[PDB]
């Protein structure tokens, strides 16, 4: 896919180095449009950074900090849309990218740690925010840059905080450069001016000729002067055409504005017009893919299995909120207080962050660590939206066995813009989420678990959706001793897929099941009960069904399908005792029914409207 979503961490440190690097690589492998932010921090020396060559447009902001690699290739980058800015002031931040200036005495011929020279030959647009460059003890040429050319005329915040201190005598701009403002020493690094050398009123142009003016809806430079020839669409890119609005999906007559579906309808996703919304987002009636349904509009699963927001006539159902969703917005974790709102929540919305305080208490709030026997709140939950943080579990629980019915987690709310799970600080031994069958979006980290197996075995790929998702191993208990001890699935588990030890958890198994365990076989003729097969389920025969091995005991659950009733026949049913009949619809027992010779629950020939005291030897009321 050409569209990914970037991280959101600002200056928080990596969860792990050997995980952070691969996190970047999985997030930006072949991506061309980066929705969300773009963050590069604590990049070690000799970093690959090749996966960045094909990034063209950034929809958030660019952050680079505390780096020791000497060059970060971002040539094909063109436009920085600045949707959400760094510190609400910056859209391109490059700071501290050099040695801490403490000791770090370089040996002979050693390049000191720090970005040698910016190299961005096609970055010629910034739609908002400013530039923040400082504390770069090896950067060159950053001052000889005409930034106001890079900025956009609407970006009135043309505020730059640029520093010039350096410890190396930078080589002069190569003579081929014009204006002596060069990104680098090589001849092709001279800045291309597209905002100081255009015609009168031309925002962008190919060159200093009054026919080089770009169309009114391009971004930076143009191959041709038609709106289909932009290097980057300003507002919407509908099928290679730069338009101002995606075509509406309903036509209204000018008299009644009656809604007639328009086959040429387009939904909006980022700065692009998409015919149908992507997998995880929701299509609303107003015509925009989103994540959270608006007010008085509720999730409804469409006929084709997709989801969409539908209008409510009656008040929409009582959706059981989680955390960080609507009104528990800044609520961090679940105490014993909010947990009570989670009674009868088959579907939850929002995160459930679990800081260690949840299981270590907070004296100021008078909240004890929540009980390991306080988890019954989360038992009928079947769908969570957003992530599911975990950094405290009870030791009495050997795992996260609590959520046996959570069937769907969707990644509509990720932890840092990146993470849909997390398993860090735990001491658990497995998972046991036997019913989690879909994991919408975002990487799932399982981090710093010293007692954990069942991560090299979980059926991953069958849960993810896009190629961009990836799952990251770190500090997890070694698979080598996991196998040696034998923390894997068992034979019935199809394809070696599982979640934890014991035959309980298998996403799939060859033989049948009797409710919570894949079986070796059903008990049809041999077996303590008698069970008939249905959807590979061994439903037990009715107790009245006489267990007659050698013949099919039953053909169903009700009494009618027993091969031969054990005791008596009240046709068409099997009974252990021929019940005393009743005359009316309203309850009244005159007896009036006796078992026959072979079990036919005969009615009593005798009738006693007066309820005669004398009782026939058969049980009938004997007439006085």
């Amino acid at each position, epitope marked *: 896919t050409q569209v990914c979503t970037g991280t959101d961490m600002k200056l928080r440190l990596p969860a792990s180095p050997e995980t952070h690097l691969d996190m970047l690589r999985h997030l930006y492998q072949g991506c061309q449009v980066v929705q969300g932010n773009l963050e590069l921090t604590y990049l070690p020396t000799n970093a690959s950074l090749s996966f960045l060559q094909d990034i063209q447009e950034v929809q958030g902001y660019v952050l680079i900090a505390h780096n020791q690699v000497r060059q970060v290739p971002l040539q094909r980058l063109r436009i920085v849309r600045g949707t959400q800015l760094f510190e609400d002031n910056y859209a391109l931040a490059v700071l501290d990218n050099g040695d801490p200036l403490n000791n770090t005495t370089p040996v002979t011929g050693a390049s000191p740690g720090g970005l040698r020279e910016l190299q961005l030959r096609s970055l010629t647009e910034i739609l908002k925010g400013g530039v923040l460059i400082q504390r770069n003890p090896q950067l060159c040429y950053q001052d000889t840059i005409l930034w106001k050319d890079i900025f956009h005329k609407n970006n009135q915040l043309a505020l730059t905080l640029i520093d010039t201190n350096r410890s190396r005598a930078c080589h002069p701009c190569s003579p081929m450069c014009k204006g002596s403002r060069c990104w680098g020493e090589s001849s092709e690094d001279c800045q291309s001016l597209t905002r100081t050398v255009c015609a009168g009123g031309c925002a962008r142009c190919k060159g200093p000729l009054p026919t080089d003016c770009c169309h009114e809806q391009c971004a930076a430079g143009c191959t041709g002067p038609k709106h289909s020839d932009c290097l980057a669409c300003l507002h919407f890119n509908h099928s290679g055409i730069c338009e101002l609005h*995606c*075509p509406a*999906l309903v036509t209204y007559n000018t008299d009644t504005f009656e809604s007639m579906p328009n086959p040429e309808g387009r*939904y909006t996703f980022g700065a692009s017009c998409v015919t149908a919304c992507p997998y995880n987002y929701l299509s609303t009636d*107003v015509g925009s893919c*989103t994540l959270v349904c608006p007010l008085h509009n509720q999730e409804v699963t469409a006929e084709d299995g997709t989801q969409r927001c539908e209008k409510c*006539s009656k008040p929409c159902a009582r959706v059981c909120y989680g955390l960080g969703m609507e009104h528990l917005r800044e609520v961090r974790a679940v105490t014993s207080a909010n947990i009570q709102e989670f009674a009868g929540c088959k579907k939850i919305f929002g995160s459930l962050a679990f800081l260690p305080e949840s299981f270590d208490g907070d004296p100021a709030s008078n909240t004890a660590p929540l009980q390991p026997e306080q988890l019954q709140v989360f038992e009928t939950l079947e769908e969570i939206t957003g992530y599911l943080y975990i950094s405290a579990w009870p030791d009495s629980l050997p795992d996260l066995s609590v959520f046996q019915n959570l069937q769907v987690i969707r990644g509509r709310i990720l932890h840092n813009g990146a993470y849909s799970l997390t398993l860090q600080g735990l001491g658990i031994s497995w998972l046991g989420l036997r019913s989690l069958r879909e994991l919408g979006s975002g990487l799932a980290l399982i981090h710093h678990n010293t007692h954990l197996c069942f991560v090299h075995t979980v059926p991953w790929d069958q849960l993810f959706r896009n190629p961009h998702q990836a799952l990251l191993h770190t500090a997890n208990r070694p698979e080598d001793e996991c196998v040696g001890e034998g923390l894997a699935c068992h034979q019935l588990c199809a394809r070696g897929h599982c979640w934890g030890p014991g035959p309980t958890q298998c996403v799939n198994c060859s033989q049948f099941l009797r409710g919570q365990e894949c079986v070796e076989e059903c008990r049809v003729l041999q077996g303590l009960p008698r069970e008939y097969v249905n959807a590979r389920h061994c439903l037990p025969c009715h107790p009245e069904c006489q267990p007659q091995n050698g013949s099919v005991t039953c053909f169903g659950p009700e009494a009618d399908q027993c091969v031969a009733c054990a005791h008596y026949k009240d046709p068409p049913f099997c009974v252990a005792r021929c019940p005393s009949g009743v005359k009316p619809d309203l309850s009244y027992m005159p007896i009036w029914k006796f078992p026959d010779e072979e079990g036919a629950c005969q009615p009593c020939p005798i009738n006693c409207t007066h309820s005669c005291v004398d009782l026939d030897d058969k049980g009938c009321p004997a007439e006085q």
Partner: antibody, heavy 119, light 108 residues
């Protein structure tokens, strides 16, 4: 907290032109077709128009169908009501509102702009 | 052009009593009522939708009812804070017009 700061309300001659700007804030802008509703002095409510940000489409009462324009600048969360072909009976307070479902009952309202028209 | 009218023109009533406000439409609408309460000089506040269900957060001191072409708002216990204008608006057919007004004043 949802809040729609209307602005641009000032004196303008009859049959003139003006540009009201309703800077929204506090909610996802592109998920609620917004509406413009004018309350005259000492009168009941009217309903001028509504606009859907993604399409840019406009639906207005017939009496204004040839005089008012609706535009969206989704880059700035604004929403421009281009008022044109004015008249004496145009003095109003133009509450900028949000449709709850795209079904024309509003809940969140601006404080209004005493758009005054007179020579 | 559903001329959605209301009555009484004025509803003078002291604190803590029971009073009614009637909205009758020009035509028939199954459930298309949105009742609004407006303060004297501020933004109108949504009160009722679908003619029966109270808006989120609105005090349960009252709740209208009705359908078709007759709807009503019934005060259970009027208080000093609920002395302001009210209207109905039909969100069913073109062009979605509002009511006309029914003030509330304490009798003395």
């Amino acid at each position: 907290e949802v809040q729609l700061v209307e602005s641009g309300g000032g004196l303008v001659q009859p049959g003139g032109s003006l540009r009201l700007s309703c800077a929204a804030s506090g909610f996802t802008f592109t998920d609620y077709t917004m509406d413009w509703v004018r309350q005259a002095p000492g009168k009941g409510l009217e309903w001028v128009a509504d606009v859907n940000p993604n399409s840019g489409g406009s639906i207005y009462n017939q009496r204004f169908k040839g005089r008012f324009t609706l535009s969206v600048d989704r880059s700035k969360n604004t929403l421009y009501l281009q008022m044109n072909s004015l008249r004496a009976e145009d003095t109003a307070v133009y509450y900028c509102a949000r449709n709850l479902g795209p079904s024309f009952y509003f809940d969140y309202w601006g404080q209004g702009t005493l758009v005054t028209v007179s020579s | 052009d559903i001329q959605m009218t209301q009555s009484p023109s004025s509803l003078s009533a002291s604190v803590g009593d029971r009073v009614t406000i009637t909205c009758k439409a020009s035509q028939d609408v199954s459930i298309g009522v949105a009742w609004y309460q407006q303060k004297p000089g501020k933004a109108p506040k949504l009160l009722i939708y679908s003619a029966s269900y109270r808006y989120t957060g609105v005090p349960s001191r009252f709740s209208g009812s009705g359908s078709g072409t007759d709807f009503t708002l019934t005060i259970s216990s009027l208080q000093p804070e609920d002395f302001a204008t009210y209207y109905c608006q039909q969100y069913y057919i073109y062009p979605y017009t509002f009511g006309q007004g029914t003030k509330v004043e304490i009798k003395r």
